[PDB]
Design a binder for this molecule. Structure first.
Ligand code: MG
Ligand code: MG
Lengths: 291, 291
């Protein structure tokens, strides 16, 4: 039962050694905007060098896997394989492919509330999209992602497709909002999904953290022992909660959304699924336990 | 206990109406559908008045300010209505905001409104200053969410920025999730927009319209209404009937609008008593036989 203790000294050395792998969130963890967290690339290098598997699990639905790979390299993280990158965009594409395979050749299209990156990810998996060139099939799912073009007319159109009870409703994630470098915030997919759910009378299947589906997506490709895996994230309600549901050890890093006082709040209220096992000021602190 | 969803007719119709001091009517789906009035509706109101029964009209439609709503009654054939009898969520939101924003005298701020011209006009009639109107724009001191066909991701972002200030109020005209259009499709309702704003800002909105009791408070500031001698007549179980139960009125479901008889009997069989009407009629025209 997590005590939100500061990981350092010998415990830090033991916990990492036992680890088969570390799961990292990206935003708030490896970088903030275009500023990387100092030490992070070096940390990743030393991890790989010590044979510890690294995967990246993000709720960000804006970037398709190729463009995510380029961001990593451009920001100084070399030697990443694309196979290591799991976004809500990617796993939503895969979930939708599997729920729509059906025997019927009469595949439909997905109506997407989101950007080019999310669309690209779905096309990469082989899905057809409403609004692409040519005839438009029957819309068979609405996908809600991070959608800067969100509009009343697009909400209305989403709801029309949803009047067909066989049309599925999927959301990339429910993050409510995200911090921007200038100090402001942008609404998250979770706010857009709440609108879509309310106007259509439906509940979405949610793909991203803290939904376990994300772990399912990851385990289709890699063998993961949750008991020997660290989940490292900056956000208690998505990263930590996810980690607990999957049985992983959880590390809150303090370079992002949540504060230690938010964690200690939850601890005192006994909501243990939101209490990290450990915390660090930044992921850089983890290196003292390595060589 | 009580509501049994009985058909109001015969002697029961005669008794219920005789005991009544007044009847509260919802508008859309009850007196009319789009531009088509419910046959008999104008006659009913007239006959109610001749019998000394008070009538008031209570609507969540946040689109027409009170002057234009009054002109609509008159144009569609409802004679003898005074505008003082019309209570929309727009009006009651303006009054709530006028109550809550008299304070630092002169240092009134502005209201940032997600909604249409009608709602804007209603707020201005109450003396409120609006962000986006001419001139400066005082500090924003409230966000109001209403029916906003121009709802957009950037405006949601702007609402959220005003709401970072914990002292800025959040009000919603109502939580209706969607509304029927004449062609069989639906338009998203304020409830869907409000859910987006609440989720992205981390706030709970003060809701003005039915089934919030605030709407009844707004009515009783102007008229003495004894809930025990008043009928609440509506087409929507989850808004009109719940409202009536919360305020302690007798509730009459009419079948010319959104909800069905079977939806009501389902609520009854399920023991959800606050969603079961005391009586129903096929149309409000049926009420006339009791006069
Ligand atoms: Mg993060
Ligand atoms: Mg109605």
């Amino acid at each position: 039962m997590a005590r939100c203790e500061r990981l350092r000294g010998a415990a830090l050395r033991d916990v990492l050694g036992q680890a088969q792998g570390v799961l990292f969130d990206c935003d708030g963890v490896l970088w903030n905007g275009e500023r990387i967290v100092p030490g992070a690339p070096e940390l990743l290098q030393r991890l790989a060098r010590a044979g510890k598997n690294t995967l990246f699990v993000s709720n960000n639905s804006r970037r398709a896997r190729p463009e995510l790979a380029l961001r990593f390299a451009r920001l100084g993280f070399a030697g990443l394989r694309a196979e290591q990158l799991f976004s809500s965009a990617l796993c939503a594409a895969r979930l939708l492919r599997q729920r729509l395979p059906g025997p019927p050749d009469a595949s439909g299209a997905v109506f997407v509330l989101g950007g080019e990156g999310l669309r690209a990810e779905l096309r990469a998996a082989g899905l057809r999209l409403a609004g692409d060139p040519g005839e438009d099939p029957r819309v068979r799912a609405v996908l809600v992602g991070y959608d800067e073009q969100f509009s009343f007319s697009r909400l209305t159109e989403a709801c029309a497709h949803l009047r067909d009870p066989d049309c599925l409703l999927v959301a990339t994630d429910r993050d409510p909002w995200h911090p921007l470098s200038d100090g402001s915030r942008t609404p998250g997919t979770g706010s857009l999904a709440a609108a879509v759910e309310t106007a259509s009378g439906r509940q979405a299947l949610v793909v991203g953290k803290p939904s376990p589906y994300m772990f399912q997506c990851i385990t289709e490709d890699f063998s993961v022992d949750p008991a020997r895996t660290l989940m490292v994230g900056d956000r208690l309600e998505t990263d930590i909660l996810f980690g607990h549901r999957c049985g992983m050890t959880t590390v809150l890093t303090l370079t992002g959304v949540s504060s230690l006082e938010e964690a200690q709040a939850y601890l005192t209220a006994g909501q243990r699924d939101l209490v990290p096992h450990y915390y660090v000021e930044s992921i850089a602190d983890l290196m003292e336990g390595l060589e």
